[PDB]
């Protein structure tokens, strides 16, 4: 299993503009288009992102291209972030995937907001950190996905996804 397959499981793939769990306009593999209520603002952003007149729809190829860009940007973001980089560097390969997953869903800023949990991960206090991560809006809003990520940090294996 790898970051791409993990994220493809968590986000799904949709080839027509859709609304995410928060109600925002998204397309592909969790690619947020805009937080704006306008489907028109969304269709404009989409065309700008793809470089063609899409009319709210894209091909598999376009979805994957967007996905490659987003995972890349998430990774580069972590490495440039002063709060995030040290944590990332301290982790093993599977757990690194869990942090990337959080960053892709919630942005750098958002994850950087989990101060206490980050400190516990850096310390390698797995169980403690899993309990702390669960005390967030994130966990209450998307509990099954949060649980999968949480189990990933807790165990350092892909068991939560080997099911799926």
UniProtKB/Swiss-Prot annotation:
Effect noted on mutating residue 20 to A/N/S/T: Complete loss of enzymatic activity
Resulting phenotype, residue 30 to A: Almost complete loss of enzymatic activity
Top class in the EC scheme: hydrolase
UniProt effect for mutating residue 117 to V: 50-fold decrease in enzymatic activity
Any one cellular-component term (Gene Ontology): host cell cytoplasm
Gene3D superfamilies: 1.10.530.40
A Pfam family per the record: Phage_lysozyme
Keywords annotated in UniProt: Antimicrobial, Bacteriolytic enzyme, Cytolysis, Glycosidase, Host cell lysis by virus, Host cytoplasm, Hydrolase, Viral release from host cell
Main location: host cell
GO BP annotation list: cell wall macromolecule catabolic process; defense response to bacterium; peptidoglycan catabolic process; viral release from host cell by cytolysis
Outcome, altering residue 132 to M/F: 2-fold decrease in enzymatic activity
Induction: Expressed late in the viral replication.
Family stated for the protein in its record: Belongs to the glycosyl hydrolase 24 family.
Name of the protein described by the UniProt record: Endolysin
Organism name: Enterobacteria phage T4 (Bacteriophage T4)
